[model samples]
Structure formats: structure tokens, C-alpha cells
Target: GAMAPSYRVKRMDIAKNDEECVVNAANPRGLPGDGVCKAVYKKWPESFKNSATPVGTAKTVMCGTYPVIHAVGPNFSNYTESEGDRELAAAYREVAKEVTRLGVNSVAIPLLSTGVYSGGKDRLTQSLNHLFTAMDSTDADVVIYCRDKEWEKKISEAIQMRT
Candidate 1:
């Protein structure tokens, strides 16, 4: 039999979640850059601007209309098998923990990692390998914010969560 999914994975509309918590990637310096962060920061800056980033750190800025979790994931310089995996996983787990801490049933995170962990190691496979495997049956419900539901399906297909 196939492995049962440890936790339920789903999607959400970030735009509608004005009062909900949103999560994004951050650099070690805690600055929102290029990809997901930029999109998130453009629509909302205070959350990304006022958060802290120290590699593997996750900060929740509640001053915004909605709470934003700035989680520091991977990058070009620090992207490695061990470091990349640890960094991405830690940040990912924090989003789950933060929602419970914030008394919210759901939180949103971007599936696009950008250039994070671009170690030339078949990026997609590696990120999926690290991120998805790390996110099995987690403690909290993390709503993955992607451009389309198909992207989420692609990710799920890439890594099947195992118990």
C-alpha cells in the first residue's frame, strides 16, 4: 500500500487572507528579496521590513493588518545538502508552530523557493526532496500559496509524505 500522508496539504488565496498570517522566505540579514518575499513585501512591507533574519530563524511580525512569518530559508552562498536541508526545514517548521502560537487555524507559505539552495543539484528535486520530506505530518496546518493549484499538485507528486 502507498504511504498515508502524514499531514494534509492544501492551498489558499493569500489576497483574501488580509487578516490571516502569511509566511515568506528571508535572507540572513532578514531582508525580503527577489521572488516570493518581494511579492509579499510589495503588497505588504511592514511584515517583511520589521522581521529578523539570521539563517534558520523565523519571526512573526504582528504589527501588520495580518501576521507575517518571515522565515529565513536557503540562498546561493549557503546552499548545501546539510545546510540547505537544515535551513529550509527549520524555517518551514516554524511557520507551522507560529500559527498555533498565534491562535490561527491556517498560515500561508510560498512554494517557489526562488534561487534558494541553487547548488546546481537539480534544484527542483533537491528543494522538493528537502522541503516536502521535512514537512510530514507536521504539527500545524500550513497553507502553501502558489500561483496555481497545479503547482501544489506537482510538488506533492515530487515528494510523497511518508510516516
Candidate 2:
């Protein structure tokens, strides 16, 4: 029997411009210029032109550019453990479902709740597993790109076992 399709986990620095550039350049079908910024622009060119809000702020809006959905959640540090993290994860799961429905071949994500939200490895991993599991069991691929080596290994192992 064929094993479930394994998720692809890669290491990437979200803080660096190069990382965003990499994702953009690799996906020319959508926004590639400024990563999420370009994506948002493409999706909502009018709003992007009028709004001056920052990308990661709570006020930021969710933008969908067909195959890719650029979702920037609020800063993690601003939310309490019980409130923010849960909401973030839930939102991400919804986005994952939307991505699948859009007929995207693959979805790549960073550790959403990890960086500023005080989410530990276990929390982040669980969130990822939950999101990926909720996706349609089609041939669509899900990848979680991490900046930390340990996180990368853990995600890789977890994905392998899920297959």
C-alpha cells in the first residue's frame, strides 16, 4: 500500500528578506515581489493602495491571491495564552481548508503561533498537525518551513510518521 504523502518541512528565516524573496520567486503565479505584501496588493489592490497598516498587525486583513493566501496574524506577545493562540490556530486551519478548496497543489507555512505568541514546539507542532489533518486528503502537499533546526527535525519526524 502507498504510504500517506509525507509533508515537506524546510528551514527558512522569516526575518530575512531573502526568505520572503525565495517564496515569491518560487511562486511567480502569485505575489512574489514583496511576499505577502505583494500578494495582498494583488488580491486587494484597492485596499493595499489606500491602507497604511503594517502587515503583521491585528488590523491587517486576510488576502487571497488564488493559489496562495497571505494571512498575517497579530503579534503573538500581545495575546494571552488562552485567547490569542487558540484563535490563531483556528484561523490558520480555516485558511488551510480554503487553500485546499482553491485547488492549490501545495501550501507552505511558517510556524504561525511560535515566534511571538510564546507557543512552544509542542504547541506549534500540534497546531500544524491539526491544520494539515484538516486538509482534504487529496494529492495536495503541505509544507511547514522552520528556521530552527530542532523544530525542523521534529516537524520532519512528525510528518514522516503521519504518512
Candidate 3:
């Protein structure tokens, strides 16, 4: 099927499909009774109930059957500026490893560490750059669903440049 073209960061709405995978750029620690988990339940109720593996950051519940993987690495609450770019790179690698292990084809990723996590643009962008670069060679059709256009543009540019 045809997909949308690469553009600057924006919330591009798309119809749901039966692709092998879907990525979500969402907060790992979603709200108590709402958030991505609720969305997943609404989308794939059957899978959410039958999945053997637990989902969510603490693995408290079965992360829905849709294979929703967390992309954001370690988060910074107060922006202490502890780690450098290398640490972000390492986090990307770890996330990449997890993604690969899941054997997902289409991943729906959100703006990692950018929202409530508030990791800052420069750091988050750099981290996403490294993460996308690491996964560039894969066959997975990455879909980064950002909350705004700036993020979309930044991520699109970063991915296009690397790929």
C-alpha cells in the first residue's frame, strides 16, 4: 500500500493496517488507567488478552497482542545533564536490540523522551538519530507518529540522511 511522504514533523493521521508491526512514540509510564495501553486495548483486544509476554515498563500487564515496544531509553526528570551523546547512543543500541528481538516489521514510535519526560530537543533528537541509524538497514517500515511537525521534520531529516 502507498504511504505518506517524508515531511517535517507533524501528526500525520493514517488508517490502521494489518502490518506485521506498529511503533508508538509514547510514554512508557502512561497514565494509571489511560494512555497507550488503553489505545492498544481498543485496537487489538484479542491480542491484548492472549499474549503470553507481559507488556508495560514494569511488565505489570500483558502489553497487548500488538507487540507495543517502548522506544524511549532512560529518561531525565530534572535535566541534570549527566550523560553525553555516547550514553544516548548506547540507549539507542539497547532499544534497537529489543526491537530486533521482537521481530516486528512495522514499528510505531513516538517522540521518545520529548514530552512529559522532557529530555530536551537536542538530546532527544540525537538519541533518535542514533536509534534510526542503527535500524536503517532493517526491512522494518518505521512509522514515527509525533505529536507535532517540528519533531516529524527533525526525525525525517535524520532518518533520510542516514538511510
Candidate 4:
């Protein structure tokens, strides 16, 4: 049997989390214009010149003070429903892999692609499904951070459902 990470939801800023590592919903263009990407950009200068990473892939970058896993998810507007879900899952799977490889004790993550990228409740549920399942073999403390009131409730309910 596999082990699952310690998971929870918190109303907090992913960039400001005290975890050893944090995840940014990086775009394929590496543009940190809005949402989590912008937050990461403001906290670290490397975000400004980071090269593009394709969807469903992840890379680690130094945040000066800590490491950031730049995970790229799909822009749902450009992908069909199932395709979008798959891409989002792939992004989280890559994130999980990076977490294990980095051997970090804790990692903070946002609901990847659930914001400006246009993922809705279904996507939210699917995102958790993929993330929790993919992370089942890891032992890191995984916190999914949310800033919006609506999303905070949604994320709490979703996590409760899965647990």
C-alpha cells in the first residue's frame, strides 16, 4: 500500500507560505502576469527571465530564499474538457515527482489552473483527484492554498470528500 501526504487547505498566499517549498502555476510562456505566477514574480526576480515550459511539465527554480516548483497546467479555454483535466493532472503529477526528488519536508501549492486559466468546480474536483492520487506515495506535508473565499470553501469540501 502507498502512503499519502499530509494534506490540508488554508486561506493563505502561496508565495508567503512558510513551507520549505511552494508551487507556482507557471504558464508555458513563463509570463508571471497574474495570479500565482505574478505573486512568484514579485517575490523573486528569476521569474522575470525564466524560459517557457510546456504544459504538463514542471521545473524547479530558486526563489532566492527558497525553491519554487514552476508547474504548467493547461489554459482550459484552449483545451477540451477531458483534455484540460488530463493536462492539469499531469502538472500535479510532475509536481509530486519534484517533491519526492527534492526530498522537501513541506510544500505549498495553489489549486493549479483553477484561477485565470478558467478551471471550474469540475476541474477543481478533478485537480484534487489527480493531486492526492499522484501524491499517495509521498510523505511530504502538502498544503493547498487558496485566496478566494469561494474557492476556500470549495477546496475544503473537495478535500473532505476525498478523505
**Which scores greater on TM-score, model 1 or model 4?**
4
- Give Cα-based local distance difference scores for all models: 0.59, 0.47, 0.47, 0.80
Tens digit of lDDT per residue, candidate 3, span 1-163?
1144221333553225344554433334443223443455466444333223212121112344556443334455543445534444554454456556666655555444555444444555655676566655555565666546676666767766744
The number of clashing residue pairs in each candidate reads: 0, 1, 17, 0
**Candidate 4, residues 102-121: lDDT per residue as tens digits?**
88888888877778787444
Compared with the true structure, the alpha-carbon lDDT of candidate 2 equals 0.47
Q: Which prediction has more favorable TM-score, 3 or 4?
A: 4
Count backbone clashes in candidate 1: 0
- TM-scores across all candidates? 0.69, 0.57, 0.58, 0.87
The model with the greater TM-score, 2 or 3, is: 3
- Strongest candidate by TM-score: 4
Return the TM-score for candidate 1, rounded to 2 decimals: 0.69
Error of 3 at 109 (Å): 1.4
Model 3, TM vs. native:
0.58
For residue 71, model 1's alpha carbon misses the true position, in angstroms, by 0.6
Candidate 1 vs candidate 2, lDDT winner: 1
Ranking by TM-score: 4, 1, 3, 2
Clashing pairs in 1: none
Task: Please give the range of 10 consecutive residues that has the lowest summed lDDT in model 3.
Answer: 52-61
